[PDB]
Design an enzyme around this catalytic site. Structure first.
Site, PDB file in Angstrom:
ATOM      1  N   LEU A 147       0.826  -1.188   0.000  1.00 25.87           N
ATOM      2  CA  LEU A 147       0.000   0.000   0.000  1.00 25.87           C
ATOM      3  C   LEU A 147       0.869   1.250   0.000  1.00 25.87           C
ATOM      4  CD1 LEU A 147      -2.989   1.153   0.432  1.00 25.87           C
ATOM      5  CD2 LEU A 147      -2.433   0.954   2.861  1.00 25.87           C
ATOM      6  N   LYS A 176       3.150   4.638  -1.787  1.00 28.47           N
ATOM      7  CA  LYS A 176       4.210   4.911  -2.751  1.00 28.47           C
ATOM      8  C   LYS A 176       5.636   4.820  -2.192  1.00 28.47           C
ATOM      9  N   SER A 214       9.051   2.733  -0.032  1.00 28.31           N
ATOM     10  CA  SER A 214       9.939   1.582  -0.189  1.00 28.31           C
ATOM     11  C   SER A 214       9.124   0.280  -0.135  1.00 28.31           C
ATOM     12  CB  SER A 214      11.012   1.622   0.902  1.00 28.31           C
ATOM     13  OG  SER A 214      11.913   0.538   0.808  1.00 28.31           O
ATOM     14  N   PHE A 215       9.279  -0.573  -1.150  1.00 28.19           N
ATOM     15  CA  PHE A 215       8.387  -1.728  -1.357  1.00 28.19           C
ATOM     16  C   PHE A 215       8.348  -2.703  -0.180  1.00 28.19           C
ATOM     17  CE2 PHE A 215       7.355  -6.039  -2.794  1.00 28.19           C
ATOM     18  CZ  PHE A 215       6.186  -5.848  -3.516  1.00 28.19           C
ATOM     19  N   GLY A 216       7.141  -3.025   0.276  1.00 23.47           N
ATOM     20  CA  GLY A 216       6.935  -4.054   1.297  1.00 23.47           C
ATOM     21  C   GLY A 216       6.934  -3.603   2.752  1.00 23.47           C
ATOM     22  N   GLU A 217       7.272  -2.339   2.991  1.00 24.78           N
ATOM     23  CA  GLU A 217       7.333  -1.794   4.349  1.00 24.78           C
ATOM     24  C   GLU A 217       5.933  -1.540   4.926  1.00 24.78           C
ATOM     25  OE1 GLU A 217      10.084   1.550   4.543  1.00 24.78           O
ATOM     26  OE2 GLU A 217      11.799   0.228   4.201  1.00 24.78           O
ATOM     27  N   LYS A 259       2.412  -1.451   8.999  1.00 24.43           N
ATOM     28  CA  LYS A 259       3.801  -1.087   8.815  1.00 24.43           C
ATOM     29  C   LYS A 259       4.655  -2.181   9.431  1.00 24.43           C
ATOM     30  CE  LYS A 259       7.178   1.071   8.222  1.00 24.43           C
ATOM     31  NZ  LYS A 259       8.112   2.104   7.717  1.00 24.43           N
ATOM     32  N   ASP A 262       7.016  17.311  13.042  1.00 27.27           N
ATOM     33  CA  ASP A 262       7.305  16.978  11.637  1.00 27.27           C
ATOM     34  C   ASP A 262       6.090  17.101  10.718  1.00 27.27           C
ATOM     35  OD1 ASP A 262       9.183  16.493   9.645  1.00 27.27           O
ATOM     36  OD2 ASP A 262       8.937  14.299   9.737  1.00 27.27           O
ATOM     37  N   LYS A 271       4.160  18.193   7.674  1.00 24.81           N
ATOM     38  CA  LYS A 271       4.488  18.492   6.302  1.00 24.81           C
ATOM     39  C   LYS A 271       3.481  17.707   5.477  1.00 24.81           C
ATOM     40  CE  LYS A 271       8.305  15.106   6.490  1.00 24.81           C
ATOM     41  NZ  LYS A 271       9.715  14.878   6.084  1.00 24.81           N
ATOM     42  N   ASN A 326       3.208  13.966   5.584  1.00 21.31           N
ATOM     43  CA  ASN A 326       2.666  13.364   6.801  1.00 21.31           C
ATOM     44  C   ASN A 326       1.196  13.685   7.043  1.00 21.31           C
ATOM     45  OD1 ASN A 326       5.109  12.076   7.311  1.00 21.31           O
ATOM     46  ND2 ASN A 326       5.855  13.704   8.680  1.00 21.31           N
ATOM     47  N   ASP A 365       2.706   9.689  11.087  1.00 17.69           N
ATOM     48  CA  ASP A 365       4.158   9.657  11.305  1.00 17.69           C
ATOM     49  C   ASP A 365       4.573  10.474  12.533  1.00 17.69           C
ATOM     50  OD1 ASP A 365       4.783   7.773   9.328  1.00 17.69           O
ATOM     51  OD2 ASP A 365       5.967   9.130   8.096  1.00 17.69           O
ATOM     52  N   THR A 414      11.990  18.888   9.324  1.00 14.56           N
ATOM     53  CA  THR A 414      12.284  18.849   7.891  1.00 14.56           C
ATOM     54  C   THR A 414      12.477  20.266   7.371  1.00 14.56           C
ATOM     55  OG1 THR A 414      10.935  16.847   7.586  1.00 14.56           O
ATOM     56  CG2 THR A 414      11.488  18.113   5.579  1.00 14.56           C
ATOM     57  N   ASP A 427     -10.184 -12.665  26.305  1.00 18.29           N
ATOM     58  CA  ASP A 427      -9.815 -14.032  26.727  1.00 18.29           C
ATOM     59  C   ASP A 427      -8.339 -14.312  26.386  1.00 18.29           C
ATOM     60  OD1 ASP A 427     -10.012 -16.698  27.709  1.00 18.29           O
ATOM     61  OD2 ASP A 427     -10.973 -17.411  25.877  1.00 18.29           O
TER      62      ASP A 427
HETATM   63  N1  LIG Z   1      -2.510   4.182   7.594  1.00 20.38           N
HETATM   64  C1  LIG Z   1      -1.981   4.323   6.353  1.00 20.38           C
HETATM   65  N2  LIG Z   1      -2.763   4.221   5.267  1.00 20.38           N
HETATM   66  C2  LIG Z   1      -2.260   4.360   4.024  1.00 20.38           C
HETATM   67  N3  LIG Z   1      -0.969   4.606   3.746  1.00 20.38           N
HETATM   68  C3  LIG Z   1      -0.067   4.734   4.749  1.00 20.38           C
HETATM   69  C4  LIG Z   1      -0.535   4.596   6.136  1.00 20.38           C
HETATM   70  N4  LIG Z   1       0.551   4.769   6.914  1.00 20.38           N
HETATM   71  C5  LIG Z   1       1.616   5.003   6.100  1.00 20.38           C
HETATM   72  N5  LIG Z   1       1.243   4.975   4.808  1.00 20.38           N
HETATM   73  C6  LIG Z   1       2.125   5.196   3.634  1.00 20.38           C
HETATM   74  O1  LIG Z   1       3.202   4.261   3.530  1.00 20.38           O
HETATM   75  C7  LIG Z   1       4.322   4.905   2.900  1.00 20.38           C
HETATM   76  C8  LIG Z   1       5.624   4.676   3.673  1.00 20.38           C
HETATM   77  O2  LIG Z   1       5.676   5.317   4.951  1.00 20.38           O
HETATM   78  P1  LIG Z   1       6.719   4.751   6.039  1.00 20.38           P
HETATM   79  O3  LIG Z   1       6.142   3.478   6.585  1.00 20.38           O
HETATM   80  O4  LIG Z   1       7.182   5.840   6.987  1.00 20.38           O
HETATM   81  O5  LIG Z   1       7.974   4.388   5.101  1.00 20.38           O
HETATM   82  P2  LIG Z   1       8.741   5.540   4.271  1.00 20.38           P
HETATM   83  O6  LIG Z   1       7.737   6.628   3.978  1.00 20.38           O
HETATM   84  O7  LIG Z   1       9.422   4.833   3.116  1.00 20.38           O
HETATM   85  N6  LIG Z   1       9.977   6.194   5.318  1.00 20.38           N
HETATM   86  P3  LIG Z   1      10.647   5.102   6.509  1.00 20.38           P
HETATM   87  O8  LIG Z   1       9.447   4.319   6.987  1.00 20.38           O
HETATM   88  O9  LIG Z   1      11.259   5.967   7.588  1.00 20.38           O
HETATM   89  O10 LIG Z   1      11.642   4.294   5.709  1.00 20.38           O
HETATM   90  C9  LIG Z   1       3.978   6.374   2.785  1.00 20.38           C
HETATM   91  O11 LIG Z   1       3.496   6.627   1.462  1.00 20.38           O
HETATM   92  C10 LIG Z   1       2.841   6.523   3.771  1.00 20.38           C
HETATM   93  O12 LIG Z   1       1.993   7.608   3.431  1.00 20.38           O
HETATM   94 CA   LIG Z   2      -9.511 -16.736  29.870  1.00 19.86          CA
END
Ligand SMILES: Nc1ncnc2c1ncn2[C@@H]1O[C@H](COP(=O)(O)OP(=O)(O)NP(=O)(O)O)[C@@H](O)[C@H]1O
Ligand SMILES: [Ca+2]
Ligand SMILES: [Ca+2]
Ligand SMILES: [Ca+2]
Ligand SMILES: [Ca+2]
Length: 467
Positions: A28, A30, A32-35, A51, A138, A140, A143, A159, A178, A415
């Site tokens: 979900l 934009k 770093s992939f998979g975080e 996350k 922070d 911006k 966030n 954030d 920032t 429970d």
């Molecule tokens: N509850 C949420 N719903 C939808 N998107 C989210 C949510 N929380 C975070 N994001 C998005 O996930 C992306 C990554 O955020 P983050 O988990 O901080 O990693 P990052 O932005 O790459 N920086 P870092 O996490 O410090 O490496 C960003 O585009 C956020 O807007």
């Molecule tokens: Ca119990």
């Protein structure tokens, strides 16, 4: 030792593993992939944003402890926080509209009416934060997330990694933030919560013009400009912008912190308060139903109180809560995201007017008496305000709230040891308290304990809430 329920107390409560509660779907957003990953609650179907962090340790627990304290319509909701031998999982409400940043870089400019709606929301969030002695540090466009792709989409502040509690007795010191958004006094290294108001003023400047008020080739160049503090409304860029918007920007980018406007006063600024005269539409039936539900809550025991709050605060979506959210904002006269005594009184008076009732039929203090009773009963954490999750929990149609799945989810949450029965110790733990009063557990048992074993099974749990 008091049992004051908050949505935050549920966040780290699960004895279960992440993969036993959630199924991963797609990535979900934009970044770093998979975080960050979109997941489905295995029991309820509810989609959430997870996350995932591989294991920095200490600061993430600080972030979680702060988010747990905050319950506001413009602040990100945190559902659960899991920790494995190798991973942290931060499970939160999903917001599908992307960053405000991305809306900005895809258009020349926001209209004054559009920027005002967005800034109102940010200011509502940070007015609430500051009242709770928390500063963001922070703020911006990156966030601020839009809840959905809809054009009317609500804003969520996210954030809280750089956030902290602040005190009036000692100043903050950490040169943190920032470059475009950081308050000059943060750079100098002695500052207070007004640093957030500055950042918000920069966001506003960018919304109306499309450019940062302090700009440059690199981080060092930006920071020197911020330090110096000088900005301008360049023509013709700003020619069409009203004096009133410029007045607000001037107040929020006021260099001397003690002379800078507070978030509350910025929320109350004429540009914010008068940008629209549109009234939120609420139909009589829904308000009446909400007030009905609200006033009937008096006397509820502690297991039921915690169960209901868990379900309302953690297990209800925005689509499910649309009408109630609208009612909440209608009643929230000063728009700070909390309902106070005065606001509840006006809510009652509003309903009476809508229903075509005669107010003088009641004695002068009849409404005040009603609201004082409602307050004791619905104010779960006894902080003297009704917060968004408290309101929705109590105002929602009870049959709607108590779905099969929400019931199962709630029961398994309480429970802890999976024995099939809820104990007084398990009630004590969920409230974050050492021991539940012998008296408090008794008042639970006398209403709920149908087979007299001193514990609450799934059958009795259902009956407690459904009957
Ligand atoms: N509850 C949420 N719903 C939808 N998107 C989210 C949510 N929380 C975070 N994001 C998005 O996930 C992306 C990554 O955020 P983050 O988990 O901080 O990693 P990052 O932005 O790459 N920086 P870092 O996490 O410090 O490496 C960003 O585009 C956020 O807007
Ligand atoms: Ca119990
Ligand atoms: Ca209010
Ligand atoms: Ca409260
Ligand atoms: Ca029993």
């Amino acid at each position: 030792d008091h049992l004051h329920a908050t949505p935050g107390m549920f966040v780290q409560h699960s004895t279960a593993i992440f993969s036993d509660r959630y199924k991963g779907q797609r990535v979900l957003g934009k970044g770093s992939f998979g975080e960050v990953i979109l997941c489905k609650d295995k029991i309820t179907g509810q989609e959430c944003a997870v996350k995932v962090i591989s294991k920095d340790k200490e600061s993430l627990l600080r972030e979680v402890q702060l988010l747990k304290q905050l319950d506001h319509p413009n602040i990100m909701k945190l559902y659960e926080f899991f920790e494995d031998k190798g991973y942290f999982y931060l499970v939160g409400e999903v917001y599908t509209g992307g960053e405000l940043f991305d809306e900005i870089i895809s258009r020349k400019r926001f209209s004054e009416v559009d920027a005002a709606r967005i800034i109102r929301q940010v200011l509502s969030g940070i007015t609430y934060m500051h009242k709770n002695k928390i500063v963001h540090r922070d703020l911006k466009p990156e966030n601020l997330l839009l809840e959905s792709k809809s054009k009317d989409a609500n804003i969520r502040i996210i954030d809280f990694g750089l956030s902290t509690h602040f005190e009036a007795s000692k100043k903050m010191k950490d040169k943190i933030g920032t470059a475009y958004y950081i308050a000059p006094e943060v750079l100098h290294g002695t500052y207070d919560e007004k640093c957030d108001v500055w950042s918000t003023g920069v966001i506003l400047y960018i919304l109306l013009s499309g450019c940062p008020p302090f700009n440059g080739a690199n981080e060092y160049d930006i920071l020197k400009k911020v330090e110096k503090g000088k900005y301008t409304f360049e023509l013709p860029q700003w020619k069409k912008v009203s004096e009133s918007a410029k007045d607000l920007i001037r107040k929020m980018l006021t260099y001397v912190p003690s002379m800078r406007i507070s978030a509350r006063d910025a929320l109350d600024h004429e540009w914010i308060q008068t940008y629209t005269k549109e009234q939120i539409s609420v139909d009589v039936p829904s308000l009446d139903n909400a007030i009905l539900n609200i006033r009937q809550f008096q006397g509820t025991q502690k297991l039921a109180q915690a169960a209901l709050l868990y379900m309302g605060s953690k297990l209800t979506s925005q689509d499910e809560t649309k009408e109630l959210t609208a009612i909440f904002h209608k009643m929230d006269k000063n728009g700070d995201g909390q309902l106070d005594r005065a606001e509840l009184i006006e809510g009652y008076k509003e309903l009476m007017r809508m229903k075509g009732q005669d107010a003088s039929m009641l004695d002068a203090s009849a409404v005040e008496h009603e609201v004082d009773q409602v307050l004791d009963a619905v104010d779960f954490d006894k902080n003297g305000y009704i917060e968004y999750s408290e309101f929705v929990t109590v105002a929602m149609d009870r049959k709607t709230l108590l779905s099969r799945e929400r019931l199962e989810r709630a029961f398994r949450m309480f429970d802890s040891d999976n024995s099939g029965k809820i104990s007084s110790t398990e009630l004590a733990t969920i409230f974050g308290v050492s021991d539940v009063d012998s008296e408090t557990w008794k008042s639970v048992l006398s209403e709920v304990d149908k087979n007299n074993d001193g514990e609450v099974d799934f059958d009795e749990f259902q009956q407690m809430l459904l009957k």
